[PDB]
């Protein structure tokens, strides 16, 4: 399979290199007969010879148009005649782009900023990551001695750990006697030993976490100071900065970019990411511990444990994310190095750029800086969000559209080239915004989106007709890769950097979305006796007041068949589930419970460790009283009862501890919060106290700011102190339950004494 492509220069001529892994053997093809080009729209053909006189200079040499060729293409559906101007070297184009455009005979230029090797992949129709090949993956990471204030790469690299499917080792230059640790002479020998590992294993994919920004730039800096090269590429080249890092013969897969745009987390440390998707917590050791262990020697086995686990975790994450990103690269038609480092809008643009070439479509240019900001200062209406019905409801059903925006794009032919197109037999008119879309011919984007949807379901129907997961699991990643690409079309329409930018298109798609969801609302209540409780863009919750649970399900499934016969095109509603009961506090804040007693919340729960246990406990009691017992009054009695025990000092102090983490040297704090004030009293008493240390405190009764009444929770003693009951009532328990109970008419006044 094709892994990557780039170009080298020989006697001024560019030579394409195609990096392939081919039946377990690395292979490089060379193409020297491919040349860069741009397109130029001229006011008149008589002046092409005048334009072919335009010259520029770079690195002393002159830059010339070496060939011209008149070609008839389509620009957003319209036929256009354009001149293809060839050049000798790809780096000639940026030196002569503007002078060709600034010429009086030239209206505009097109396709002038495509990377040369990717231009080759498109024009030749080559798809990376296509085939059977077993790619060899290897992960690596480093630890560094760091002292506060150092300016990156000042301290040396300690431990270079690596892990693959068979092994996990750590290379350090101090003696640590574990079977998986290899001790070498110096930091320079440690780097040299890692180069031998790369040369020995010869991996196809180099897996890192945050290696673009830390691991490999740290290597490049340290190896420079130590006077040693890093021939990590399969052609013997150093890693190249593009900020991201390339390794020529291989695929530098940095997991940070994929994970950051796939899963939403509070922080993206390696430990937080690991158990967010595997469930196993990972122990973290901070820079202050790593330093001290290397200074003395105390606990270096613990750091070798942390270094080895860092590599094994990086390999395990890289292994589970690689098959998806591989199928995504295959679908978009660009190398995984680029696919794993681009937003969804850029993934769509590469896909259409390839499709535009296949369809002889001229591609629009990227916006200038000023048009880019004007697009950013644009806005349009979004999805229909309803202030929900208050109170507790029984027998809720969930109904939502299936691919609402993709189905609207296809059904109404929403595309930049069909927008307000004159002389058509038909148009679909968008509600409110009133944009017209011609229906006489398939739009460029709706055509591609249609084939993606239908190809996805052919894959679904070929997954059931299977028994291996040698493709069933491979088809699953492929169909979900199509779902990612197809569900990115709408966002691309409003992507300010997009070439096929069309805000009128995205504005129309969301306008239809509000029309159809409100149409479902009307038929639900005026023809089927339902009561819709909550609406969010493409879905809603509804119930039949007083009806039995089974009768609500039966009429909900019948409404689905009824409303889908009346919906046009691919627009399809579906039944998504039943809930025993639930309530809605406001927009995007509600709580439900399903038929297995499983409580589901949204925008309500307090999960941070900044909350005392008595806060999380009381909120959990309230939700279960309302959802499991259907008793709003019991939930009010719970809060009221908790506030009584709080003021009578009957709540045990462990449920009152607030854990906070010191993330910094104490003297650099200006926000002197309670945990910082406690940490400073510990430091003054001789305790060491360093970033990463968690405190855990309790607020005592006293005068002004709670930053002064904080006591180290381990030092609390009821015979000696008393906690600020008013703090934990007004700042912990009540803020955890107030707006939940406010949704039922109660108030802060009703939850005290």
What does the model show?
The PDB classes it as transferase. Keywords: DNA polymerase, transferase. It forms a monomeric assembly. The chain has 753 residues and is α+β, with helices and mostly antiparallel strands. The chain folds into 5 domains: 1-130 and 343-363, DNA Polymerase, chain B, domain 1 (DNA Polymerase, Chain A, domain 1); 131-342, Ribonuclease H-like superfamily/Ribonuclease H (Nucleotidyltransferase, domain 5); 364-442 and 496-601, B family DNA polymerase, palm domain (Palm domain of DNA polymerase, Alpha-Beta Complex); 443-495, Helix Hairpins, CATH 1.10.287.690; 602-753, no CATH class. Helices cover 39% and strands 20% of the residues. It is built from 23 helices and 27 strands. The chain has a 6-stranded mixed beta sheet, with helices on both faces. Strands 21-22-18-23-24-25 form a 6-stranded antiparallel beta sheet. A hairpin with a 3-residue loop joins strand 15 and strand 16 (245-246). Helix 9 (300-332) crosses helix 15 and helix 13 packs across helix 17. The longest helix is centred in the middle third of the chain and has 33 residues, at 300-332. The protein is globular and about 95 Å long.
